[PDB]
Structures are given as C-alpha cells and as structure tokens.
Amino acid sequence: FDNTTYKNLQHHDYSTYTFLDLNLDLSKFRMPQPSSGRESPRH
Amino acid sequence: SGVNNTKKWKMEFDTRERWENPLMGWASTADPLSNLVLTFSTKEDAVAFAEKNGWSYDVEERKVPKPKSKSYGANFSWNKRTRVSTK
C-alpha cells in the first residue's frame, strides 16, 4: 500500500484527437438513438 | 405597439384637391372640411351625428386583433416545427 506517488499520469500522453478517438471507439456500445420523427425542425 | 389610439370612433370626410401655391409652393386648399375630424364613443353615436347633419356616410366595422395562443415552451418542441433555431 503506497500513498506517496501520483497515479494519474496517463494524461501526459494525450494528444489532439484523444477525446474524439475515444468517442469513435464508444460508438459501437451505444443503444440506438430515439427519433423525433423528422430529419430536422425545418422538415 | 401601443393600442391607445384605437379606442374611439372617428368621422372624417373625403379628401379633396391640394395644389401648390405659386408664390412659395405651399399646399393650398379650398376644402373647408379638409381638417375636420370628430370623435365618438360608439358607431351609433357617429351614425346619429351623420344622419342629423345630412351627410352620406360609410361605416367600417371595428377590426379587433384576434386572440392568439402563445406558448414559450413551444420554442423547444421535441418533434414540431415551432422549435426555434436561435434565441
């Protein structure tokens, strides 16, 4: 048991597209979205 | 947007000729009634006044804005076209 080191160092290697790459990765896990019934409020 | 000048009935007369004054170019008139405008509580009062003075007249029915259905919430409709794209 250690309490003297910082264990949140992964973010020192994050880059420009890290957040959106993870969002792309999560895309296969989502439930299908609900539908308002039309393509947009202007349709 | 003020509606306070739409409360009362008015009586005006037909518009007649105005011409340019040769000296100054001012608008001249020969119509003694060109500026006459009477005010009445109701159209019955106006009609009564017109009848006893021998003037032929036209009465136009008062136009009142029709009551509208307003809903702020409709600005954010989930599935209707009333949703606003900007605020």
Swiss-Prot record, chain A:
Keywords: Electron transport, Membrane, Mitochondrion, Mitochondrion inner membrane, Phosphoprotein, Respiratory chain, Transit peptide, Transport
A Gene Ontology BP annotation from the UniProt entry: mitochondrial ATP synthesis coupled electron transport
Protein name, per record: NADH dehydrogenase [ubiquinone] flavoprotein 3, mitochondrial
Similarity-based family: Belongs to the complex I NDUFV3 subunit family.
Subcellular location: Mitochondrion inner membrane
An example Gene Ontology CC term for this record: mitochondrial inner membrane
Modified residues (Phosphoserine): 40
Full protein stretch here: 67 to 109 of 109
Subunit annotation: Complex I is composed of 45 different subunits. This is a component of the flavoprotein-sulfur (FP) fragment of the enzyme.
Gene from which this protein is expressed: NDUFV3
Task of the protein: Accessory subunit of the mitochondrial membrane respiratory chain NADH dehydrogenase (Complex I), that is believed not to be involved in catalysis. Complex I functions in the transfer of electrons from NADH to the respiratory chain. The immediate electron acceptor for the enzyme is believed to be ubiquinone. May be the terminally assembled subunit of Complex I.
Organism: Bos taurus (Bovine)
Signal sequence annotation: none
Curated annotation (Swiss-Prot), chain B:
Name of the protein this chain belongs to: NADH dehydrogenase [ubiquinone] iron-sulfur protein 4, mitochondrial
Localization per record: Mitochondrion inner membrane
Function noted in UniProt: Accessory subunit of the mitochondrial membrane respiratory chain NADH dehydrogenase (Complex I), that is believed not to be involved in catalysis. Complex I functions in the transfer of electrons from NADH to the respiratory chain. The immediate electron acceptor for the enzyme is believed to be ubiquinone.
Family: Belongs to the complex I NDUFS4 subunit family.
Highest taxon in the source lineage: Eukaryota
Subunit structure: Mammalian complex I is composed of 45 different subunits. This is a component of the iron-sulfur (IP) fragment of the enzyme. Interacts with BCAP31 and TOMM40; the interaction mediates its translocation to the mitochondria; the interaction with BCAP31 is direct.
Modified residues (Phosphoserine): 85
Boundaries of the shown chain within the full protein: 89 to 175 of 175
Region: Disordered, residue numbers: 61-87
Posttranslational mods: Phosphorylated.
